[PDB]
Design a protein around this ligand. Structure first.
Ligand SMILES: [Cl-]
Lengths: 199, 199
């Protein structure tokens, strides 16, 4: 058995496709997938409740081995009617918009703070929401703007229900990490599953 | 300060739009929205941590007043390339399909069991997943089929990345409940917001 805990973007928008391909070739090797925020993953790995974790924030622990797995682009986005949805925008313009943020313990929250919000003037947090789908829909209906993985909003961007916002910074790139306990021995079955995770 | 706790279908797909219409008419009156599962909502109401809760399953407590708030259609869905997406299916074919289901004890699993799975001869669960978004991605990539609120799959049905299964069953309707503690009184500030939570 392979027991996995994954962060929100990874567990909801990546690993189900990987598991589908894996189960097709190994239909009699079970997999358990739990999804939470990156802090949830860390604690599950530290408690030896899962075999492997996947996180999307800089989570640190002397008891954890972290290995780079995938790149991931964070995207500032807004309702299509927002003035920010068209043309160049400045950091001061971003700081004047209502921001919708994830909860403490989200890797996305921490990375967005370092890569972007740390460079903004005083800005208002309009709402704090505990998952990325509530944020997507709050932004779609004009409650504010936010910043999430392109993977989370890709389908809305294509359908025109959300709009990407230009940011005067380099592409907001982060690493999606594979983690396991420093004292954990990875099974051959798991290492085989990780081959399906490799792009 | 109105403090809401809502299950995922309601908090992610219904209330964001409602809060928008409300804050547009009451910008000075704030709203705090927490999203989780129905059981999280129940405990938050019991612990007096929120003013009102919204749930999507038959959960019951003797300390709670529950009122039917909205009806909600459950829909069986599959990858567009699935044979089960092409024409009417039999109960036998549904019973043989790989089911992607929410965990036992959740409101969605209980109501899906009652309205759908209890009518199938000896179905098998291909995988258990803890939230609707992971389920959608799993089904989208062919891991199996599932049953969720039409509201939750609407965008993907429109995009054509998920397909509705033509099942030989009645239209499957569940209840979305509004709840509060039985000794709580709905303030006029909250009753006004609830007028915006009125179809
Ligand atoms: Cl019910």
């Amino acid at each position: 058995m392979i027991r996995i805990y994954a962060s929100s973007t990874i567990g909801n928008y990546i690993l189900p496709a990987v598991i589908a391909r894996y189960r097709h070739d190994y239909p009699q090797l079970p997999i358990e997938l739990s999804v939470g925020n990156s802090q949830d993953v860390m604690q599950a790995v530290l408690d030896f409740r899962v075999d492997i974790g996947f996180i999307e924030g800089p989570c640190h622990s002397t008891e954890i081995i972290s290995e780079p797995w995938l790149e991931d682009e964070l995207v500032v986005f807004a309702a299509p009617t927002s003035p920010l949805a068209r043309g160049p925008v400045t950091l001061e313009q971003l700081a004047a918009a209502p921001w919708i943020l994830r909860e403490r313990g989200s890797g996305t929250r921490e990375i967005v703070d370092y890569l972007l919000l740390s460079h903004l003037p005083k800005f208002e947090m309009a709402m704090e929401l505990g998952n990325s789908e509530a944020i997507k829909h709050a932004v779609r209906h004009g409650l504010g703007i936010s910043c999430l993985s392109r993977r989370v909003i890709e389908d809305q961007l294509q359908a025109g229900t959300l709009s990407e916002v230009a940011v005067p910074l380099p592409r907001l790139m982060r690493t999606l990490w594979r983690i396991h306990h420093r004292q954990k021995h990875l099974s051959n079955a798991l290492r085989r599953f990780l081959d399906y995770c490799d792009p």
